[PDB]
Design a protein around this ligand. Structure first.
Ligand SMILES: O=C1NC(=O)C(c2ccc(Oc3ccccc3)cc2)(N2CCN(c3ncccn3)CC2)C(=O)N1
Ligand SMILES: [Ca+2]
Ligand SMILES: [Ca+2]
Ligand SMILES: [Ca+2]
Ligand SMILES: [Ca+2]
Ligand SMILES: [Ca+2]
Ligand SMILES: [Cl-]
Ligand SMILES: [Cl-]
Ligand SMILES: [Cl-]
Ligand SMILES: [Zn+2]
Ligand SMILES: [Zn+2]
Length: 159
């Protein structure tokens, strides 16, 4: 799921197609909004929620096979995936609803942190080799600003 294209515009739009049964819709909406805010905080990018399939980043929760040729694997393992910039499915973010979605310390996975990571992918970032960076391919909950200098350097290099 690695690509070589970046968005040719900075006013990015996203559409929350559906939701997970683990969290209230208001909490989900807010987690996604806060995740995007992390990236717009260090770049000239903006993220506007829309209600149309024409959004750049379409967000959906799915289980096992869900359309694209990359079905989820149930509890744990693959948590989600996002397609790099481009038209159509490109740029979209899919979350495995077989996971226990939560926030903060505790069991389950933070939808906030995972979304922030997935949106990094949706923006064209690849994985980071820095263990403490958000783009590091390993889920670990920790307090503190999600973006590491490496993440900031990486996203600014693109936008
Ligand atoms: O697009 C991706 N990219 C990933 O690296 C992914 C994942 C998604 C989001 C993550 O959030 C995160 C990243 C850094 C710090 C805190 C939280 C961490 C890991 N990991 C999850 C763990 N996954 C893995 N798990 C078990 C066996 C093999 N691989 C590798 C991919 C993922 O689910 N989707
Ligand atoms: Ca900004
Ligand atoms: Ca798209
Ligand atoms: Ca899974
Ligand atoms: Ca779930
Ligand atoms: Ca949790
Ligand atoms: Cl729904
Ligand atoms: Cl926040
Ligand atoms: Cl959190
Ligand atoms: Zn998918
Ligand atoms: Zn990743």
């Amino acid at each position: 799921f690695e690509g070589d294209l970046k968005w040719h515009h900075h006013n990015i739009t996203y559409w929350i197609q559906n939701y997970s049964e683990d969290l209230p819709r208001a909490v989900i909406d807010d987690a996604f909004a806060r995740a995007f805010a992390l990236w717009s905080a260090v770049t000239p990018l903006t993220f506007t929620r829309v209600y149309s399939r024409d959004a750049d980043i379409v967000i959906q929760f799915g289980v096992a096979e869900h359309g694209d040729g990359y079905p989820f694997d149930g509890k744990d393992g693959l948590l989600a995936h996002a397609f790099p910039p481009g038209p159509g499915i490109q740029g979209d973010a899919h979350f495995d609803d077989d996971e226990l979605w939560s926030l903060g310390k505790g069991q389950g996975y933070s939808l906030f942190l995972v979304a922030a990571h997935q949106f990094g992918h949706a923006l064209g970032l690849d994985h980071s080799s820095v263990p403490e960076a958000l783009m590091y391919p390993m889920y670990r909950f920790t307090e503190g600003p999600p973006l590491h200098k490496d993440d900031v350097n990486g996203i600014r290099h693109l936008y």
